[PDB]
Amino acid sequence: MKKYTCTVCGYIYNPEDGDPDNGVNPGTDFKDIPDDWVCPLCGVGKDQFEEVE
Ligand SMILES: [Ga+3]
């Protein structure tokens, strides 16, 4: 699974770690994160994230 970065603040979503404090468990692909989730550091939506290639 690919990492995704918040293009507003630089936070990296790592699917190995998830974001468990906000209900995203380890092993969750970015696409399967509920679409109302926001960047845990800066608060913007998923639509400001881009795949890390
Ligand atoms: Ga951010």
Curated annotation (Swiss-Prot):
Entry's Gene Ontology BP terms: alkane catabolic process
Keyword tags: Electron transport, Formylation, Iron, Metal-binding, Transport
Sequence positions that bind Fe cation: 6, 9, 39, 42
Annotated coiled-coil segments of the chain: none
Co-factor requirement: Fe(3+)
Keyword presence, Iron: yes
MF terms (GO), sorted A to Z: electron transfer activity; iron ion binding
Domain Rubredoxin-like: 1-53
One protein family per Pfam: Rubredoxin
Superkingdom of this protein's organism: Bacteria
InterPro entries in UniProt: Rubredoxin, Rubredoxin-like_dom, Rubredoxin_dom, Rubredoxin_ET, Rubredoxin_Fe_BS
Modified residues (N-formylmethionine): 1
Cofactor note: Binds 1 Fe(3+) ion per subunit.
Protein family membership: Belongs to the rubredoxin family.
PANTHER family xrefs: RUBREDOXIN, RUBREDOXIN-1-RELATED
Protein function: Rubredoxin is a small nonheme, iron protein lacking acid-labile sulfide. Its single Fe, chelated to 4 Cys, functions as an electron acceptor and may also stabilize the conformation of the molecule.
Protein name (record): Rubredoxin
Species of provenance: Clostridium pasteurianum
